[PDB]
Amino acid sequence: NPLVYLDVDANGKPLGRVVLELKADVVPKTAENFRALCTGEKGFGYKGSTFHRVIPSFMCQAGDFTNHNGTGGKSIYGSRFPDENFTLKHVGPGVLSMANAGPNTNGSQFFICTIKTDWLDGKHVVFGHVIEGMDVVKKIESFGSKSGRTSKKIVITDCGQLS
Numbered sequence: 538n539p540l541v542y543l544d545v546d547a548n549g550k551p552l553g554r555v556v557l558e559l560k561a562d563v564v565p566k567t568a569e570n571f572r573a574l575c576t577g578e579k580g581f582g583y584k585g586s587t588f589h590r591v592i593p594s595f596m597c598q599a600g601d602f603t604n605h606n607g608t609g610g611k612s613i614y615g616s617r618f619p620d621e622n623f624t625l626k627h628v629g630p631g632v633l634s635m636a637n638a639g640p641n642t643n644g645s646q647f648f649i650c651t652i653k654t655d656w657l658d659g660k661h662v663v664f665g666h667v668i669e670g671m672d673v674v675k676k677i678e679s680f681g682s683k684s685g686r687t688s689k690k691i692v693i694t695d696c697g698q699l700s
C-alpha cells in the first residue's frame with residue numbers, strides 16, 4: 538500500500554499536510570490512479586487544484602483539476618474507469634473514496650469523509666485512508682459550509698508519493 542501526501546493552504550496560508558495510505562492490496566487500479574495523480578508523473582494531476590466542495594459533518598471533496606467545480610477531472614487511464622470493487626466501506630471520518638456521477642465514472646475527483654458516510658457504500662469506491670493529518674482535514678472542513686461553498690480558497694499546493 539503506497540503512501541502519498543497533499544499539502545493544503547487556505548487563501549495562501551498553509552494548513553499542513555494530509556498523509557494517505559492507498560489500499561492497493563484491495564483496489565490496485567484505483568490506488569495507482571490516485572498515486573500517479575499525486576506525483577503528476579503523467580503530466581497532469583492534483584497539484585494546484587482545490588477542495589471545491591466541503592460540507593461539514595459530511596466530507597471534503599477535491600480533485601477537479603480541469604474545471605475546479607465538481608464537473609471535471611480525468612483518470613490516468615482515460616476519461617473514466619470502472620468501479621473496481623466495493624469491498625471497502627465508508628466506515629468513519631478519514632476514509633478516502635472516489636467521487637463519481639453514477640456507475641463506473643471514476644476520474645480524478647475524490648473525497649475524504651468527516652463522518653461515516655455509509656449511504657455511499659456500494660456506490661463509491663473506497664480506496665484509502667488518512668494516516669496523518671486528520672487535524673488538517675478538520676481544518677479544511679472548517680472552511681466549508683452547508684451548500685459546499687468554501688469560505689476560503691483551499692488549494693493543494695504540493696502533493697506526491699512518500700513510499
Ligand SMILES: Cc1cc(C(=O)O)ccc1-c1ccc(C[C@@H]2NC(=O)[C@]3(Cc4ccccc4)CCCN(C3)C(=O)/C=C/C(=O)NCC[C@@H](C(=O)NCCOCCN)NC(=O)Cc3ccccc3CNC2=O)cc1
Binds near residue numbers: 610636637661
Ligand atoms: C470523471 C467523469 C467521467 C465521465 C465520463 O467520461 O463519462 C462522467 C462523469 C465524470 C465525473 C463527473 C463529476 C464527478 C463529481 C460529481 N459531480 C456531480 O455529481 C455534479 C453533476 C455532474 C455530473 C457529471 C458531469 C458533470 C456534472 C457536478 C458537481 C456538483 N454536483 C453534481 C453535486 O454536488 C452532486 C451532489 C449530489 O449528488 N448530491 C446527492 C446527495 C449527496 C449526499 O449524500 N448528501 C448527504 C449528506 O448528508 C450528510 C449528513 N447530513 N450525495 C453526494 O454528494 C454524492 C457524492 C459523494 C461524494 C463525492 C461526490 C459526490 C457527488 N458527485 C459529484 O460531485 C465525478 C466524475
